[PDB]
Amino acid sequence: AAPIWMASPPEVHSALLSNGPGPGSLVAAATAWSQLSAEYASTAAELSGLLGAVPGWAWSAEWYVAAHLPYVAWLTQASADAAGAAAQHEAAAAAYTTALAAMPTLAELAANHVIHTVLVATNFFGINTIPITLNEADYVRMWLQAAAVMGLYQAASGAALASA
């Protein structure tokens, strides 16, 4: 509902985000809205030219085409909304793909912990290279990297979800 991203390790953030169906469904909707936005504009064209299907004699029954005409404004608004939805889905699909590329890998997190347990075992000669501080400091980097990517992926997809 209202999660705190820096409260949990990067292993859970990377586990939830890295393994899923994929963005293939968001692009499937983006291209559907855009194709649906061309139909709303295409039909608005042939509807605005409804006259011409009426023969010469118009003495009478012009009220017919005049009652179907107000809906051309409806088809323009419908094409606009359907065109914005295609951009929302297209943007949300890009936020995920980049957030995944920024999330630290689980194998990168596993290798971090594995190397920590072995540096604690034997570290005398190379102790001014401070490998314990760097490895532990390299973990908090992944801690903050994951917590930052999620805080942005929220506001990125949260902003790409608001409309009207």
């Binding site: 890295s18 169906p21 194709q35 649906l36 039909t43 979800l161």
Partner: protein, 73 residues
């Protein structure tokens, strides 16, 4: 149907059927979009898009209906 409105009714009838054809060509895909992952953002946003996709499909569906029945004279 009146005498000279035969081609007019056939024109409006041909485009309301074209909308329903495109309305259903994209109905199942914009109403049920699956999250790309399991994090709470991919679920909240994909659930919002589906919430928008269904609220949009029902308004445009009845709109085609109200369009096709505008001629009662």
């Amino acid at each position: 149907v009146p005498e000279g409105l035969a081609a007019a009714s056939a024109a409006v009838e041909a485009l309301t059927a074209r909308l329903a054809a495109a309305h259903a060509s994209a109905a199942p895909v914009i109403t049920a979009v699956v999250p790309p992952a399991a994090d709470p953002v991919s679920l909240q946003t994909a659930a919002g898009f589906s919430a928008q996709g269904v609220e949009h499909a029902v308004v445009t569906a009845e709109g085609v209906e109200e369009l096709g029945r505008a001629g009662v004279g």
